[PDB]
Amino acid sequence: EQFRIRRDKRARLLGRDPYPVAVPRTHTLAEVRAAHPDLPIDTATEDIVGVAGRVIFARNSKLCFATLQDGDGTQLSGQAALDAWKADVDLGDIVYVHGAVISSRELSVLDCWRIAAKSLRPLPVMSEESRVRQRYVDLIVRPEARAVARLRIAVVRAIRTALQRRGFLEVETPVLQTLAGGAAARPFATHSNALDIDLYLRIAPELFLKRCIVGGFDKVFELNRVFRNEGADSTHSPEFSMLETYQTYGTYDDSAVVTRELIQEVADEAIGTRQLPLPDGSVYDIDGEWATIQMYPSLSVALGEEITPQTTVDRLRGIADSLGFGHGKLIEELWERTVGKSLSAPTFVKDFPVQTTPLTRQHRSIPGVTEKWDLYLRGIELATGYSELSDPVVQRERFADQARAAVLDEDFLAALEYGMPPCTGTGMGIDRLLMSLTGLSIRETVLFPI
Amino acid sequence: EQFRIRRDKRARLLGRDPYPVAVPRTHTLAEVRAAHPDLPIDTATEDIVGVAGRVIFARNSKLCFATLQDGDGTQLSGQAALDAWKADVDLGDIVYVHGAVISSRELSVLDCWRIAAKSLRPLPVMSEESRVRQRYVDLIVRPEARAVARLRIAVVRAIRTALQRRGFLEVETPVLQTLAGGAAARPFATHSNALDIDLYLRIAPELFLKRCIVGGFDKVFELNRVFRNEGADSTHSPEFSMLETYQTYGTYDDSAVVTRELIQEVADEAIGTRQLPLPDGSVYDIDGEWATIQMYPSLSVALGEEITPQTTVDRLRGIADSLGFGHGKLIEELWERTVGKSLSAPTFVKDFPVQTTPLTRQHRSIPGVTEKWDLYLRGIELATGYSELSDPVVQRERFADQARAAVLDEDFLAALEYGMPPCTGTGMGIDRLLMSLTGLSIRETVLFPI
Numbered sequence: 055e056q057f058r059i060r061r062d063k064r065a066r067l068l069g070r071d072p073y074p075v076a077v078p079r080t081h082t083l084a085e086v087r088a089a090h091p092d093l094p095i096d097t098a099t100e101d102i103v104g105v106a107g108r109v110i111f112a113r114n115s116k117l118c119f120a121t122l123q124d125g126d127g128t129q130l131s132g133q134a135a136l137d138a139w140k141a142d143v144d145l146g147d148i149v150y151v152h153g154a155v156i157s158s159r160e161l162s163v164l165d166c167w168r169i170a171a172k173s174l175r176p177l178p179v180m181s182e183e184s185r186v187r188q189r190y191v192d193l194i195v196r197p198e199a200r201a202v203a204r205l206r207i208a209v210v211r212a213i214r215t216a217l218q219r220r221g222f223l224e225v226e227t228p229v230l231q232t233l234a235g236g237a238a239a240r241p242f243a244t245h246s247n248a249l250d251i252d253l254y255l256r257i258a259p260e261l262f263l264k265r266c267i268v269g270g271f272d273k274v275f276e277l278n279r280v281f282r283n284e285g286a287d288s289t290h291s292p293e294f295s296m297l298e299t300y301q302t303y304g305t306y307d308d309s310a311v312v313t314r315e316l317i318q319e320v321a322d323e324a325i326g327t328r329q330l331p332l333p334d335g336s337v338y339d340i341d342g343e344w345a346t347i348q349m350y351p352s353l354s355v356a357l358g359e360e361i362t363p364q365t366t367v368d369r370l371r372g373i374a375d376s377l378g379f380g381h382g383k384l385i386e387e388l389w390e391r392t393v394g395k396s397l398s399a400p401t402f403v404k405d406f407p408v409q410t411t412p413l414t415r416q417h418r419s420i421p422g423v424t425e426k427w428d429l430y431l432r433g434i435e436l437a438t439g440y441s442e443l444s445d446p447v448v449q450r451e452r453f454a455d456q457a458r459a460a461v462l463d464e465d466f467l468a469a470l471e472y473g474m475p476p477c478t479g480t481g482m483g484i485d486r487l488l489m490s491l492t493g494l495s496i497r498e499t500v501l502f503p504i
Numbered sequence: 505e506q507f508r509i510r511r512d513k514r515a516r517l518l519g520r521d522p523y524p525v526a527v528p529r530t531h532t533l534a535e536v537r538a539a540h541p542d543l544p545i546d547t548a549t550e551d552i553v554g555v556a557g558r559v560i561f562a563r564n565s566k567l568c569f570a571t572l573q574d575g576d577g578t579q580l581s582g583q584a585a586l587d588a589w590k591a592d593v594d595l596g597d598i599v600y601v602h603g604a605v606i607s608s609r610e611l612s613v614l615d616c617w618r619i620a621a622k623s624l625r626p627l628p629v630m631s632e633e634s635r636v637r638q639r640y641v642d643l644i645v646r647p648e649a650r651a652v653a654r655l656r657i658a659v660v661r662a663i664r665t666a667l668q669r670r671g672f673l674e675v676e677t678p679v680l681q682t683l684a685g686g687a688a689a690r691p692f693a694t695h696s697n698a699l700d701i702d703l704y705l706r707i708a709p710e711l712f713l714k715r716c717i718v719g720g721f722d723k724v725f726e727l728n729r730v731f732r733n734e735g736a737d738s739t740h741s742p743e744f745s746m747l748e749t750y751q752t753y754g755t756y757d758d759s760a761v762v763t764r765e766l767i768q769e770v771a772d773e774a775i776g777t778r779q780l781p782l783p784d785g786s787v788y789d790i791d792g793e794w795a796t797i798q799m800y801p802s803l804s805v806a807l808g809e810e811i812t813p814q815t816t817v818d819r820l821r822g823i824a825d826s827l828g829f830g831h832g833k834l835i836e837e838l839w840e841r842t843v844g845k846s847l848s849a850p851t852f853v854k855d856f857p858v859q860t861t862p863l864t865r866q867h868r869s870i871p872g873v874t875e876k877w878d879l880y881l882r883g884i885e886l887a888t889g890y891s892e893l894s895d896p897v898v899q900r901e902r903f904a905d906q907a908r909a910a911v912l913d914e915d916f917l918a919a920l921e922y923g924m925p926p927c928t929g930t931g932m933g934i935d936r937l938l939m940s941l942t943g944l945s946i947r948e949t950v951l952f953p954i
């Protein structure tokens with residue numbers, strides 16, 4: 055109902071300007087605080103300032119007292135002025151005030167005032183799914199939302215800083231592709247009016263990033279959304295921000311180091327500690343070195359028998375039954391369903407079934423396995439790293455097998471047959487990075503989900 | 505045909521490794537050059553280096569001589585080794601060589617060698633539309649492609665640096681939206697499997713970025729692709745990288761300054777001069793201050809009569825006929841078709857027909873016009889800046905009018921009725937920025953178009 059009284063204060067203000075083109079705000083409230091950090095309380099200083107702020111509290115009394123909250127969360131007596139103030143000023147109203155900075159019997163500004171923005175809705179004094187459907191109000195009313203938003207920003211900025219330092223170059227590769235490669239996922243398809251064909255929202259930059267390496271790039275990344283037309287869950291969302299990285303004259307052993315160094319550098323710059331406090335009352339250490347295990351061996355120890363590339367699916371099936379399609383898939387599933395869930399400490403698992411790893415080079419010594427890793431941090435599948443498959447004929451086969459389960463990405467296969475140097479790729483989910491770092495749920499990490 | 509001989513050298517090399525997982529490359533060729541800048545030519549130095557390089561030239565003679573070109577473009581005698589070399593090594597083959605750095609009777613490496621990547625295609629010794637459909641080969645064979653790629657990268661990095669310095673925060677807003685607002689364009693629609701509904705690939709971050717400002721952001725940007733399901737031309741492509749920017753307690757007069765300062769800072773950091781050399785043999789100065797003109801006045805002087813907001817469409821129609829839908833549209837079209845095309849120097853045109861500017865605040869004094877500008881640089885529509893419309897009731901109307909020409913973006917209108925501070929937005933096309941800066945065509949600016 056208060057929706058209508060506010061709209062009526064708008065209408066009756068309209069030769070007063072409730073949405074004025076400008077106001078001469080001289081300082082943010084942070085700026086005013088950082089200025090006057092220990093003012094002898096109940097004393098006046100002649101520093102004049104134009105400040106603005108959301109009136110999130112009032113206390114009307116010859117003298118009104120409000121709380122102007124700046125958008126970051128920082129907080130900071132005309133007879134006709136006072137009347138206007140009382141009659142015109144609600145809560146969730148953005149308000150400019152020019153005057154002398156004092157401190158009360160709390161830092162306050164005491165000469166002029168004007169409405170910067172008249173709110174036609176009061177602030178709710180919030181369900182998880184009304185915080186996310188209205189992040190703008192979440193951000194106004196919940197200091198955690200304001201912190202979470204600025205963390206992702208600081209994390210993402212730490213990432214670019216960490217890669218750039220290492221002489222990586224961020225590139226922009228197509229989001230609309232004639233076919234979407236670089237991952238096992240169902241695409242989002244959109245009809246082009248221009249070309250009168252369907253196009254595919256990238257699932258991954260990998261194949262394009264690989265064309266760059268052929269193209270002569272030493273070190274490339276892309277930090278940007280990918281689109282996986284599948285079901286959202288606690289670790290999955292169909293649109294998500296991803297990092298991918300490609301370094302020439304390195305292997306998965308090289309990219310494992312960098313991936314660690316990167317994450318530890320992000321914890322530092324964004325969070326200021328590797329002793330990650332969680333909402334579980336606990337602290338998750340990610341400092342120091344991280345344990346590498348091979349999938350097969352680790353799976354074997356867990357099952358109490360030797361599982362190799364050579365282990366039949368008939369065998370694996372049986373073991374999977376005893377616990378409650380293909381070899382590679384069964385290995386990964388068993389490994390996840392056994393060792394995976396057990397892992398607490400940050401852990402690289404490497405040497406992957408050649409089946410479930412089409413783009414990854416076969417292992418240098420070990421037959422049957424590919425030089426891929428996965429990084430598990432705080433029990434979340436965080437980040438993968440490959441020694442990259444630069445053999446077009448093999449690559450052609452891997453895809454052939456894929457298709458059989460039949461048009462291939464011929465341009466990509468063309469690119470490879472020009473010659474790709476030996477290079478190691480990584481992928482890493484930013485939402486998972488934040489989840490893994492914070493204990494925040496995926497829906498809290500992104501600004502505007504649905 | 506050489507496609508088959510190469511595939512046969514692959515097959516016959518396979519216990520030689522033509523795609524080896526690693527090679528111990530110690531330096532890039534740049535690194536080796538930067539190391540030995542003025543070596544007394546035809547003299548040997550005992551600095552040993554593992555280098556790799558694309559053999560883009562051969563000259564087989566007891567002694568072969570190649571050109572190893574590093575991916576950036578930089579350039580740098582076993583009897584059985586020599587035989588292998590001759591028989592095994594083609595052109596466009598990536599090759600590692602360990603040995604002593606010397607200079608010939610040209611800087612050369614003279615101990616071991618190995619194939620890093622066997623190319624199953626030779627390099628073409630290129631049509632604009634086979635350079636773009638094969639950028640990986642363009643990048644190998646055309647030093648300009650290598651420069652253009654690294655410029656966009658440096659431009660984009662200059663942009664983030666320039667904004668970040670000014671205390672802007674890059675945010676990630678949805679690419680898939682339930683409806684796509686922030687611009688006049690037909691969206692790309694994709695069916696979600698998750699939600700079983702169509703979603704819309706953002707045309708612009710504007711409405712989401714505006715929710716951020718409501719949310720309490722002081723200064724935000726987003727630098728990232730937008731999707732405009734319309735026809736590609738010399739200045740238009742349906743997928744393009746865009747900058748958008750929003751500053752609280754500023755007007756279009758404020759955002760005009762920043763837009764200039766930003767572009768001039770990008771010229772500097774990326775190009776190293778404001779005297780932009782063009783392929784037209786000419787130099788385009790963008791240094792110093794830039795001319796602001798009002799659309800109406802400038803249009804008037806060009807037509808030789810007074811055109812105001814009040815000028816009828818019947819009148820404007822007539823004038824448009826005399827030269828060869830709505831007022832706002834006719835004004836903009838006439839202005840473009842007259843003053844626009846005439847402009848050489850970098851020029852802001854401001855004070856826009858309220859019709860064609862729904863999201864832009866009405867002018868503070870001048871009735872009928874909105875506080876929008878457009879920046880024309882070297883005759884290209886580069887960048888727009890608004891004093892932003894924070895009046896939800898007005899905003900509701902602007903959209904109502906739009907629709908009538910009927911579901912509105914109610915969540916956005918909700919956001920505004922919580923209160924948005926006075927803020928000024930900008931948009932800027934990155935491809936146009938590069939075109940405007942270089943004289944390069946849009947298809948040359950993006951890595952992977954189609």
Ligand SMILES: Nc1cc2c(c(F)n1)C(=O)N(C1CCCCC1)C2
Pocket residue numbers: 282284289290291292294296435436437438481482483484485486
């Ligand atoms: N639907 C999805 C799918 C994924 C993610 C997500 F948030 N939603 C994610 O982080 N993924 C991977 C995790 C491993 C390294 C690359 C990113 C996949």
Ligand SMILES: Nc1cc2c(c(F)n1)C(=O)N(C1CCCCC1)C2
Pocket residue numbers: 732734739740741742744746885886887888931932933934935936
């Ligand atoms: N289909 C399209 C549409 C546009 C652009 C482009 F390259 N392709 C572009 O640069 N636009 C504008 C130019 C004005 C300021 C914001 C960017 C629109």
Ligand SMILES: N[C@@H](CCCC[NH3+])C(=O)O
Pocket residue numbers: 236237238258259260298413438439440442478479480481482
């Ligand atoms: N494309 C991978 C990430 C890069 C892995 C290294 N090639 C993924 O979808 O997870």
Ligand SMILES: N[C@@H](CCCC[NH3+])C(=O)O
Pocket residue numbers: 686687688708709710748863888889890892928929930931932
């Ligand atoms: N959304 C605008 C750019 C931002 C203008 C300032 N609000 C466009 O489509 O060009």
